[PDB]
Each structure stands twice: as structure tokens, then as C-alpha cells.
């Protein structure tokens, strides 16, 4: 266990954060992070190593967020981050850049072995992209798929797909 809040919890914070944002004129963002080439790592190193990587990734994500932001594991190799309140989309991209830059440093395994991985991020914005939690999540999900598709270790802002 990574000790990070789960999906259910994340969806809750989102609903309320979305309200707060709408009530008072503010912006919020949902970022989706997918560890690059996770499967290959498992096959070659095993699931035990995969976990150690997830844990490390969890810390590297949290260590780059404001105490106001939220980090939760959607499951397996994917994480979901809440950026609220946001002053603009530029900030959301700024934080994503930082998250991807923190992964540039190799991950030291329990037996001295090193593992270098990348983070693919899909950024969905409110209220530009979506007006509700579901859609905002779906948008961050799809934008995170295309990124994996176009390039990995990259961030991608949703647009009509």
C-alpha cells in the first residue's frame, strides 16, 4: 500500500473543489499520471520491484505539490492529482513539468539496482474542458492516453477527442 487516498476519496474532493471553484471565480485542474513502461518493468524485475517504483513515484509526486493539492492512486500504475485552486492553466502545466522533471533522476531499488522511468500526464482543466467531475476525469484520462500514444514522459492538455 502506498498510503495514498484512493479513487473514491479523490472523486469526493473533486466534487467539492469543483463547487468551491464555481461559487467563487476560480480554476481547478485534474492531472492524470501514468508511469512509463510499467509492464516491462514488472516482467523483467517482478511485481515486488514495481511496487518499490510506485512508492517512490508517489513521494516524487507529493514532494512537488502544494499542501492544498491532492494525490491519490487510481490503481495499478496510474495516479490522479488535484490542483485546486488554480489561478490559470499555465500553473497546471508548470506543476506537470516539475513532476516529469523529478522522475529524471533514477530510482534506486532495494538491492542497489537502478530503474529510470518517465511519467505521462494528461491535464484536464475547469471550466475550459469540462464542467463536471466525470467529464473532467474522462478528459484527463483521454489526454493521458494520446500522450502515451504521441510520446511518453510527456504532459498533454486535453482537447476535443
Numbering used by the authors: 254 to 414
Excerpt from the publication:
YfiN, also called TpbB, is a multi-domain membrane enzyme connecting periplasmic stimuli to cytosolic c-di-GMP production by an allosteric inside-out signaling mechanism that, due to the lack of structural data, is still largely hypothetical. YfiN is an inner membrane protein composed of three domains: a periplasmic PAS domain, two transmembrane helices and a cytosolic portion of the protein, which includes an HAMP domain and a cyclase domain (named GGDEF from the conserved residues in the active site). Formation of SCVs depends on enhanced c-di-GMP output by YfiN, which elevates transcription of the pel operon. The negative regulator YfiR is a dimeric periplasmic protein which controls the activity of YfiN by binding to the PAS domain of the DGC.
In order to gain structural insights on the allosteric regulation of YfiN, we expressed the cytosolic portion of the protein, including the HAMP and the GGDEF cyclase domain (YfiNHAMP-GGDEF; residues 183-435). The solved structure confirmed that YfiNHAMP-GGDEF had actually undergone proteolysis and that only the GGDEF domain had crystallized (YfiNGGDEF). The crystal structure of the catalytic domain of YfiN is composed by a five-stranded β-sheet core (β2-3-1-6-7) flanked by five α-helices (αA to F). YfiNGGDEF also displays an additional peripheral β-hairpin (β4-5), which is present in all the homologues structures (PleD from Caulobacter crescentus; WspR from P. aeruginosa; XCC4471 from Xanthomonas campestris and A1U3W3 from Marinobacter aquaeolei) with the exception of WspR that displays a long loop in a very different conformation. However, the cyclase domain of YfiN significantly differs from the other homologues at the level of the allosteric inhibitory site (I-site). The GGDEF domain of YfiN displays a conserved RxxD motif in the Ip , while the Is appears degenerated. In particular, the second arginine necessary to form an inactive GGDEF/GGDEF dimer, is substituted with Asp-273. Finally, the α-helix harboring the Is (α-A) is shifted with respect to the corresponding helix of PleD, WspR and A1U3W3, which all display product feedback inhibition. The shift is due to the hindrance of Tyr-379 side chain.
